[PDB]
Enzyme design. Structure first.
Site, short mmCIF file in Angstrom:
data_model
loop_
_atom_site.label_atom_id
_atom_site.label_comp_id
_atom_site.label_asym_id
_atom_site.label_seq_id
_atom_site.Cartn_x
_atom_site.Cartn_y
_atom_site.Cartn_z
CD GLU A 1 -3.02 -0.64 -0.01
OE1 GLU A 1 -2.82 0.40 -0.68
OE2 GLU A 1 -3.97 -1.42 -0.22
CB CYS B 1 24.85 -14.47 -42.17
SG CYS B 1 25.13 -12.91 -41.21
N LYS C 1 4.71 -0.77 -11.55
CA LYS C 1 5.73 -0.07 -10.76
C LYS C 1 5.38 1.40 -10.50
CG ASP D 1 11.36 0.91 1.24
OD1 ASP D 1 11.08 2.13 1.11
OD2 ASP D 1 10.79 0.01 0.57
CB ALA E 1 26.61 -13.07 -45.05
#
Ligand SMILES: Nc1ncnc2c1ncn2[C@@H]1O[C@H](COP(=O)(O)OP(=O)(O)CP(=O)(O)O)[C@@H](O)[C@H]1O
Ligand SMILES: Nc1ncnc2c1ncn2[C@@H]1O[C@H](COP(=O)(O)OP(=O)(O)CP(=O)(O)O)[C@@H](O)[C@H]1O
Ligand SMILES: Nc1ncnc2c1ncn2[C@@H]1O[C@H](COP(=O)(O)OP(=O)(O)CP(=O)(O)O)[C@@H](O)[C@H]1O
Ligand SMILES: Cc1ncc(C[n+]2csc(CCOP(=O)(O)O)c2C)c(N)n1
Ligand SMILES: Cc1ncc(C[n+]2csc(CCOP(=O)(O)O)c2C)c(N)n1
Ligand SMILES: Cc1ncc(C[n+]2csc(CCOP(=O)(O)O)c2C)c(N)n1
Ligand SMILES: [Mg+2]
Ligand SMILES: [Mg+2]
Ligand SMILES: [Mg+2]
Lengths: 514, 518, 518
Positions: free
Chosen positions: A45, A440, A143, A94, A437
């Site tokens: 809360e 690739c 958030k 905190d 490549a």
């Protein structure tokens, strides 16, 4: 009244009072959960009245204890005491852990929010006087920067490195049915000894039109032990890939004629395409979000994903998701510039890859920083992302990180060090890297090889098969060429002929154990 | 008192809020009645049904003075009140039989129709007297714009349903830049029915010189010949002769045609090389601001591949830029009929202009035909005719149909006896050469070859012969490469070489492919 | 099939966009048909003329099931289509004869009428079957709201034009807080014609409990008695006796009535002193937030002077606050009929509530009568009747008419034989006393006196007698002061003294003014 050891972290529900649907109450949502598989509840809360807060905590405490599940407060220490809560969850900004422990005594459970390995060091230089952590944000909207499972693993590894045996872990932030198994699956310690202890949700349960249903789901996921992310056998193979297995692989892909969607750079378009249909399968070079779903639905669709292309991450995320939604194979080919390190780490958070392919530099980047080093770095990457990794070079190494699709809450009893890893060599062929490549196009080859496998197929064997084939075809081209230019055209020919007369006994490359 | 038969829908004017200052609804309607509107409908969707009546009684007299009937809109009572000649309604206005019940026969009833399903009802009602067909192009004056292809679907439903009583007019987005194409390609699949007229609002009502605007539409409408490309479109029954093929190639080497490619990435390099193998020059520009000056260049030609990254905006601009100048466009709808997304995009592209040639594999051509070998021949003819175009269906046999009908169009006739079923359709084949499909953009590069052949054609050339010339050539070059190659890789380099060699010596007498009537 | 004669306009419901969720047009209309709507009109100014038809055919069956006809709106063709029982139109909808031409006789035709000029046409047309009369009060569902006074002008035109065939309903802004006043004060000047029914949209359609809302309107409509003030309104032919006048004064000294003044500045002090000279207490509050609790006080009474700085907002709030509680209001329209501005303001004020008494000089009373001594008597009777009120015309003779008719109202009847011409009208005079008009707010202070007299009246009292009581008193006090004074200045101080002395000893037998029948 609850001992630290009696806390089940399985499915850990964290509340948000201002996101509940109409004709529904927090008590109402938190009760459905409790009846369908929530095991730990935390009351949150960030804004409410300290007195409403208390009245709310007390009413849900009755509820939780009714079902015999504890209650945590994040992060009102005084309230936690006032109402006599079962534990409390604080964060990095905190109240410091010592002060708290000094106010509440050793028997109360203290959770900490952790998104970095340094924070685990701190946690461990405090001894067993922090009891669990919630690992960073894995991107939520609940958030008001996400790290992915890669980011979680570093934190798990720091627990293991520091042997903080006393500290449990739950994953949190962004978690829904569409990433949860991927999170349980690839969120394990490098030594394989420690995985996540449970899963945290807010939105998935709290903001649900049917909390009873939404929970049953997350339950199914969490207490399931096996994740088939791709419709190809993930079985663990300790034997080398026989010439019959390679041959059966190739027969299969010629017959199925797989569809290999190419998202990739400009230079790799034509070459990549021609390799593909030289392998008797068909290629689409689509980069359109509107389409990805239709393409993935096609009987043998396969996605080859190549970085540095211009396509927006949004399109890439939707592509990855489309193929994963359909349990169809993705081959990923990714750190020379900070910009590329960003983009790649990000895609790695979008989905579960079938195979990751890179050279020595890229594989060492992904491993998180010789020849035995490469075999180590290749085994790490395979394990980290639960995937078949491939390290190109004079020798190609191919590790199987899948682990048969297994996950649990205990890790995987198997590690970054003892996964199967083979090698494929055919002598020096320097000219193969004097053509663009190359890796690739090795990627195109792997994809076609994985493309064609049936349900009873084998993922690992098909990647090895693909590597053999490409190396075999580079040996043959190097012998028949007169330089760079003719080498490439010999490569495709060699690939065309080799598969058309599918007879692996013939090929040059030699397949060993690393 | 007009009888249904006396209605002339040639140029049908629909009327307010969008009038230019210093001008009146009455003035504009008069401008049109003097220089060409054979029918007026009054449309006042927001006015007081008292003003509507006054306005309508006024204009009914104006019309009747030129012997042209007046038709009311969403209003059957205003139309009885003032004794209108007919009324027009929509699918959501008043049901038709009720309307007929109040007005009796002898009052013309128009209906708005965008889909064949609606023509079906129109028919189950028997003898509704005309329909305005969907909204062809995007207007600014429910369902989305459907273009000629959607019109054609509706004309075919009339034909299938034998609804002979029902006339048709086209409506929505209709201006000088699309009328002759809409009139040219809006004919039934059996050549028997075309639009009966053309319907405008903003083109005249909103006109600063509505007298000029109307005369322009009148010329457009009662002409019969649509020269969309500056190359002859005569119908050819006789096979394309070796002398002719040799003249095409000559003509293109000489012209050295600029060939603008808008095409996927895998084709860019291949297609550029095939292009200058054929002794012309390629440009791979995807830039709107250039398209206009690019197409002004002598012998400019546009090859348009789908999938291409380009925004539909630039694509529309290019298509129009070449049609505006009467240069040929070759359209290759990539496996469009593979995903709802490509289906959308190609259908939209097909509404932007007139294509010289449409080229596709079997899948694509069966898609465009709005769905063996006879079947492929039936399909290729449908595509050719549907789009009024030379269609090519590639395969072991390449099929080439010619749906252009010499540029002819008429109102309602609608074709000089020429159906989907009997346009000339030839064939090209040089045996099985599976390897031509084991290299990327084989079909895209076919498109490059066609573009060049079509590109270099003179005013007196023939579109059909040049498309066949270029398929022979490409097939002839593929036969050779398949002999000299050692796999996919070298196949491609030989394919280019073969094209390079073949055109450096036009001796088509030598080539391998056989050209035959279908 | 209904005949024109079978129509019951008692409670006429007009129907969409403003419906409460979980409710249907059909449901609400049914709620009203079950608990009281004797006629339904369908109004769909924005719907598709196909949906309109469906909706209307549906509801025509619902209506017909309760034996109540259905009337269509701005639409004569939807009404023929579905065979409606009548149609309603406006001045800008379709002209009436055209309508009649299409629908034939036997279909009811309603018209919207706000002005007598329109009733004139209605008549030059002969036998249009009913009219809805202007928009009385501001609605939210052209011309501005006209209130009962504008209604009355229209009812009189019907009467003057002898248009007996034409019925009427009132419409616009009609809710429980103004119906009984609209029905009570909307009657022809000759007592012969009143509204035939009352017409609502938002009061039922927009209702969360349309069943309750309708029953409430039904009670309101078929009652015949409007108790607007908690004081008897019986008609009195007999002159007000000295015994009675003495009882009024007694009763007010005892009650000690709170008299709220809303009045120009020149009257504030004078009027306050006249007030507590009469043994009651004045309050000069112009504060909206107070008005409600102020009027809750026993024997509260409101004197309302025009010109007063107060915003029309607070004025409306006060008027309603006293009517809401059935306390008397005395209205003095300052030379309103002097400037367009005051004419506006008073006319608007007159639409906000029911006044016990309206007091004015000759100019004002001739204005309000919507324009010698007989003439002043004719005018005072008109004002009394027009506003259903006790009117006072001050001069050498003060005239007092009683237009209340005992609170009675009926539909269409419309009055128990009581015209503008024969309500009781008495007279008060004590010779020429020019000096009463040479001091400011003489008439305003007359108003204070009347308010106090009316103020202290019991449930069993008589409104008329108390108004006369207070004019006698004021005139009796003026006679005395004019004798004892030495000019304007002392006249005023004696006037107060005289009022103070006169009421401290009720011996009206002594007073100087003579009370007589007119
Ligand atoms: N020195 C060498 N000797 C033999 N083969 C080699 C080789 N270097 C590369 N290859 C071959 O080429 C493939 C991949 O090697 P590598 O990953 O170093 O290229 P690359 O990653 O630089 C491709 P790109 O140019 O797109 O970045 C393998 O199939 C491999 O066997
Ligand atoms: N079986 C066959 N025998 C002879 N020629 C063939 C052939 N199959 C394809 N071709 C040749 O290849 C061309 C058409 O290719 P095809 O239509 O089959 O695929 P495609 O249009 O989709 C090419 P892309 O790769 O750009 O998608 C023609 O020039 C044709 O003659
Ligand atoms: N000629 C006369 N003879 C006897 N009384 C007279 C009178 N003229 C006026 N009055 C008295 O004065 C009062 C009415 O005033 P009047 O109506 O003539 O002006 P007025 O209403 O405009 C007052 P204000 O100054 O507030 O505008 C009555 O009580 C009336 O009897
Ligand atoms: C045990 C624990 N670990 C971390 C946090 C902090 N935290 C990080 S993300 C998030 C919102 C996710 O909602 P959603 O699942 O709907 O995305 C919260 C509350 C905490 N409060 N408790
Ligand atoms: C005969 C007939 N057929 C259809 C319609 C409906 N309709 C479709 S588009 C168009 C306006 C665009 O004009 P602008 O010129 O682009 C209208 C009003 C009609 N009213 N009458
Ligand atoms: C019979 C008849 N007379 C007049 C009209 C016009 N009219 C004036 S005000 C009113 C709506 C306010 O209702 P709400 O209750 O305040 C309407 C629509 C009509 N449609 N039918
Ligand atoms: Mg590479
Ligand atoms: Mg193609
Ligand atoms: Mg006055």
């Amino acid at each position: 009244k609850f001992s630290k050891e009696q806390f089940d972290y399985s499915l850990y529900l964290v509340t948000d009072s201002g996101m509940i649907p109409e004709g529904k109450t927090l008590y109402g949502q938190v009760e459905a959960g409790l009846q369908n598989g929530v095991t730990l509840v935390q009351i949150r809360e960030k804004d409410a009245d300290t007195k409403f807060f208390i009245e709310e905590a007390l009413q849900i405490k009755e509820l939780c204890h009714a079902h015999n599940v504890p209650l945590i407060i994040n992060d009102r220490i005084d309230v936690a005491m006032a109402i006599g809560a079962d534990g409390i969850h604080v964060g990095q900004d905190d109240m410091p852990i010592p002060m708290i422990r000094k106010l509440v005594g050793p028997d109360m459970v203290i959770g900490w929010s952790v998104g970095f390995p340094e924070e685990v060091d701190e946690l461990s230089k405090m001894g067993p006087d922090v009891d669990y952590i919630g690992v960073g944000t894995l991107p939520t909207l609940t958030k008001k920067a996400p790290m992915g499972t890669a980011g979680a693993i570093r934190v798990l590894d720091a627990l293991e490195r520091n042997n903080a045996h006393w500290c449990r872990t739950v994953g949190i932030g962004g978690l829904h049915p569409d990433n949860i198994e991927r999170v349980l699956y690839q969120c394990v310690s490098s030594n394989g000894k420690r995985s996540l202890d449970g899963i945290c949700v807010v939105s998935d349960i709290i903001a649900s039109l049917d909390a009873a249903k939404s929970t049953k789901i997350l339950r199914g996921l969490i207490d399931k032990t096996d994740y088939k992310f791709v419709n190809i056998g993930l079985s663990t193979k300790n034997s080398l890939t026989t010439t019959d297995e390679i041959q059966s692989i190739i027969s299969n892909t010629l017959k199925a004629r797989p569809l290999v969607q190419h998202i990739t750079n400009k230079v790799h378009q034509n070459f990549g395409a021609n390799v593909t249909l030289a392998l008797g399968s068909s290629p689409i070079m689509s980069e359109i979000q509107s389409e990805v779903n239709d393409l993935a639905a096609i009987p043998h669709a396969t996605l080859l994903l190549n970085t540095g292309s211009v396509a927006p991450p949004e399109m890439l995320k939707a592509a990855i998701r489309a193929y994963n939604d359909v349990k169809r194979p993705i081959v990923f080919d990714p750190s020379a510039t900070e910009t590329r390190l960003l983009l790649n780490n990000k895609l790695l958070t979008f989905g579960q890859f079938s195979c990751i392919k890179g050279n020595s530099s890229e594989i060492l980047g992904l491993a998180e920083l010789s020849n035995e080093l490469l075999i180590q770095a290749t085994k790490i990457v395979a394990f980290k992302y639960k995937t078949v990794a491939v390290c190109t070079g004079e020798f190609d190494f191919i590790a199987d990180g899948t682990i048969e699709g297994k996950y649990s809450l205990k890790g995987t009893n198997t590690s970054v060090e003892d996964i199967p890893c083979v090698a494929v060599e055919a002598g020096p062929i320097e000219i193969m890297g004097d053509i663009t490549a190359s890796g690739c196009s090795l990627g195109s080859t792997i994809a076609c090889m994985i493309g064609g496998q049936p349900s009873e197929g084998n993922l690992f064997h098909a990647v090895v098969a693909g590597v053999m084939l490409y190396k075999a075809a580079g040996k043959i081209a190097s012998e028949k060429c007169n330089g760079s230019g003719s080498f490439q055209v010999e490569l495709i020919d060699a690939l065309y002929r080799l598969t058309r007369e599918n007879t692996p006994v013939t090929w040059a490359p030699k397949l060993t154990h690393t």
